[PDB]
Homo-oligomer: A and B are copies of this chain.
Amino acid sequence: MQGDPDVLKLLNEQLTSELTAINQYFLHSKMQDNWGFTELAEHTRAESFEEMRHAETITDRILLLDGLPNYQRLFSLRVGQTLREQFEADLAIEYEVLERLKPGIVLCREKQDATSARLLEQILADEETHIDYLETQLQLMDKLGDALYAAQCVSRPPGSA
């Protein structure tokens, strides 16, 4: 099938977001592991795999629509130097996803591509959950304190890479 050019442009920009999120989350999780925050690392790693799945889903749809998935381009990674900065870095990307997909979904349905819209509706709900998780962590750090919060991210006894 031939996809609509604007829908393909949109799926491709979202693809770039996902490939960027894969790297950002993956690296965060590895850095978290290396700092001793092994319990938190497991969770960030899983976020990474969800992004891998998003990238795949989008690639499929781009191919089905006879487009060219862009695996060449990445956005700028935000590599945080502390737990708080890492949550904010990943929060920043998730909110860029909303800014895009909120009008994006509406644009797909105007173009009468319900299937693309539904696919992006599913990704949006997944990213809204990530946002929810991240925002709650930053809120928890505020309530517990950085030290105390970080203590909930290590195993007993603390472990390593």
Contacts and interface: CB of A to CB of B under 8 A. Distances in A.
Given A59-B30, A63-B31, A151 B154 contact: no
B145 A147 contact: yes
A87 B112 CA distance: 25
Interface in A86-139: 98, 102-103, 105-106, 109, 112-115, 118, 121, 124-125, 128, 131-133, 135-137, 139
A60 to B, nearest CB: 6
Count this chain's copies in the assembly: 7
B40 A131 contact: no
Interface residues of A, number: 71
A1 B158 contact: no
A1 B39 contact: no
A39 B155 CA distance: 10
Say whether chain A's binding surface is mostly helix, strand, loop, or mixed: helix
Contact of A121 (B77, B114, B148, B160): B114
Contacts of A40: 157
Contacts of A148: 147-148, 151
Given A34-B64, A36-B137, A153-B156, A131 B26 contact: no
B39 A156 contact: yes
9 contacts: A34-B64, A35-B139, A36-B137, A37-B157, A60-B161, A72-B77, A105-B112, A151-B152, A152-B154
Given A27-B59, A153-B156, 5 more contacts: A19-B23, A35-B139, A39-B156, A152-B154, A152-B156
